[PDB]
Ligand binder design. Structure first.
Ligand SMILES: CN1CCCN(Cc2ccc(-c3ccc(CN4CCCN(C)CC4)cc3C#N)cc2)CC1
Ligand SMILES: CN1CCCN(Cc2ccc(-c3ccc(CN4CCCN(C)CC4)cc3C#N)cc2)CC1
Lengths: 352, 351
């Protein structure tokens, strides 16, 4: 149900980028609905009249994405490659204000569904698959600390007015974040983790349950929303996803999420995850001595659980930045504290 | 060999974007030599020590392209053609250039365009290029949109040296603005399907892949897609036809030769489209002999009319380049040649 400005532009983009019955479509026969509002990444559904016949390949329906409010070449290139490789939505139109993507009938996963075994198992293969991909991007694992550093620096020089924000900020600064960041760096630099191509934001909202596939056991999911992807420590991608088991963002009152540290996957669950990931990420694995299979798994658990620490720290720092620059209704500061609570609680669990 | 102020940048770009041996490579193991210097799109050949064994399936040798002297589209496109195996693989992409697959090869010379085998494959490859879907605007704005952009530039160009002034004055005296409109009226009444066109299909942009000079139908690749867009197919073919007449390897100023006689004969043209059509609508082969001729005769009128836009567009392009480019080349004489070819071709076609 868009506003007159968009939808007219939406109409123009579709008629000009989409082949088939689109190219002759009149404005008056153009259907567009909202999927998400806001000011950053607005989403719309666009479609032909149901009375209108497609001529060929062209889709009956597409997703319009407006970038809203030159790393945008990397994002664009990346998205086009995953499309060609069928890992992502097909790409029908790229232009300065946004893109036109394949519409994929689906819903997103809920937080509690992440712990379902088949779900978890598939997510593990998908992420594996994702990791084996060559991408024309810088292969140096600089993203994780480069990004945390960047946020830290921002964080240190931001000043709130509103009282409750000024308080929450000082308590977080109590921890001495620069010292802690460095503590975390040395801890992780001593933690071997293969640099690969990482989703980096693999949470339930960015995983699709594909329609008509809810019976297929290993084949009903697609990972989307690749905006944070980059070559990174594998441990981060897996640990960050483990961390997401703990957070529910569908909560309808301020601060608009629930943290539950008891929901972090158990040892048995993590093993169930990486037991799908591992054979999906390398060849000979399936038939290594059952004795050495364990050694890798046990080491992989220390790895992901350590890097899950970076997930807490990164997104905690990120969250604080969002509290200053974002207008979206979300308790970013409360969510900041939550991630640092988990950070230190997770610390005490690992004896590190 | 290159200058020190780039041999490093290149080493870093390679160490950091390429897998395999490239990961641990020491600055004193890095080999890099120039392919084409210049001011923009400087080419380089970066390679591993012959004494270094590759760890995986990483490339031993890669091409580095510096942008030097659009933007998102050009990069998406290259990534895509690489993903489809129409273009060189894309090994690394960054703000001031990119790493591409190095293809052992040489460029076609002008005269090779007319070898029946070479011009058959080019037709086939252009046809294949033409069937590709790309995430770009499918409205055929590019042709006259660019000619207007250039014409406006030209009517604004002011030259310093008396000669360029004379020449620009001989060109302006054709009344480009009125001529453009005569052209539009002609092409508007000339049916031509819109497709993804290479738009610059000249010999310098067609590689002859070394080690298959003997292949009959698989010895070429089209490259340099830097002008590619959705456009009237007639232009891509017409433009390529025009390129039979110009040889850019001439070593004395103005550094090209134009040769009207070397424009493809009806027979040669039919030979080209006879390869193109099968490759562009697979059913075409099964048509009635008589019907094929209907369509061929029809495509001849099409491509030869649009060849006019090739002369016009690039003629205007060449005046602009005279003022701005630092590449040594008689742009203004090339412009004059293209407009001569433009008016001669109008007379030939009686249009
Ligand atoms: C005020 N509103 C209440 C309920 C939802 N809402 C909009 C709304 C608001 C906020 C979110 C949301 C906020 C933070 C996070 C945490 N991040 C996880 C770590 C990294 N990912 C970079 C980026 C987000 C997730 C979600 C997620 N998913 C999602 C939707 C509409 C009305
Ligand atoms: C050291 N050198 C001295 C003299 C120039 N030189 C380099 C050199 C030689 C020729 C060209 C050159 C100039 C114009 C054109 C015409 N254009 C055709 C229409 C559109 N295509 C956009 C782009 C080019 C082609 C070439 C082509 N190919 C450009 C650079 C050779 C040794």
């Amino acid at each position: 149900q868009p506003e007159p400005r968009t939808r007219r532009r939406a109409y123009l983009w579709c008629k000009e980028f989409l082949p088939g019955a689109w190219r002759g479509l009149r404005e008056d026969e153009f259907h567009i609905s909202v999927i998400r509002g806001g000011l950053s990444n607005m989403l719309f559904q666009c479609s032909l009249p149901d009375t209108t016949a497609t001529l060929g390949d062209e889709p009956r329906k597409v997703l319009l994405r407006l970038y809203g409010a030159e790393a945008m070449v990397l994002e664009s290139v990346m998205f086009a490659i995953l499309a060609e490789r069928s890992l992502g939505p097909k790409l029908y139109g790229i232009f300065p204000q946004g893109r036109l993507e394949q519409f994929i009938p689906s819903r997103r996963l809920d937080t509690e569904e992440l712990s379902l075994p088949d779900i978890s198992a598939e997510i593990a293969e998908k992420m594996a698959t994702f990791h084996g991909m060559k991408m024309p991007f810088n292969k140096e694992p600089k993203w994780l600390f480069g990004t945390m550093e960047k946020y830290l620096k921002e964080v240190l020089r931001i000043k709130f007015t509103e009282e409750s924000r000024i308080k929450k900020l000082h308590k977080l600064l109590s921890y001495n974040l620069p010292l802690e960041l460095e503590n975390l760096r040395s801890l992780l630099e001593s933690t071997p983790s293969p640099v690969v191509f990482c989703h980096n934001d693999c949470q339930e909202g960015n995983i699709l349950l594909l329609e008509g596939r809810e019976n297929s056991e290993k084949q009903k999911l697609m990972l989307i929303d690749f905006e944070y992807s980059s070559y990174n420590y594998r441990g981060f991608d897996i640990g960050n996803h483990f961390c997401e088991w703990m957070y529910d963002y569908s909560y309808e009152k301020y601060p608009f999420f629930r943290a539950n540290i008891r929901k972090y996957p158990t040892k048995k669950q993590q093993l169930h995850f990486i037991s799908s990931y591992l054979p999906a990420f390398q060849n000979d694995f399936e038939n290594l001595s059952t004795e050495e299979k364990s050694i890798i798994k046990e080491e992989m658990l220390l790895e992901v659980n350590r890097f899950a620490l970076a997930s807490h720290f990164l997104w905690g720092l990120w969250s604080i930045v969002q509290a200053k620059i974002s207008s979206i209704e979300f308790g970013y500061m409360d969510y900041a504290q939550a991630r640092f609570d988990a950070y230190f609680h997770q610390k005490r669990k690992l004896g590190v």
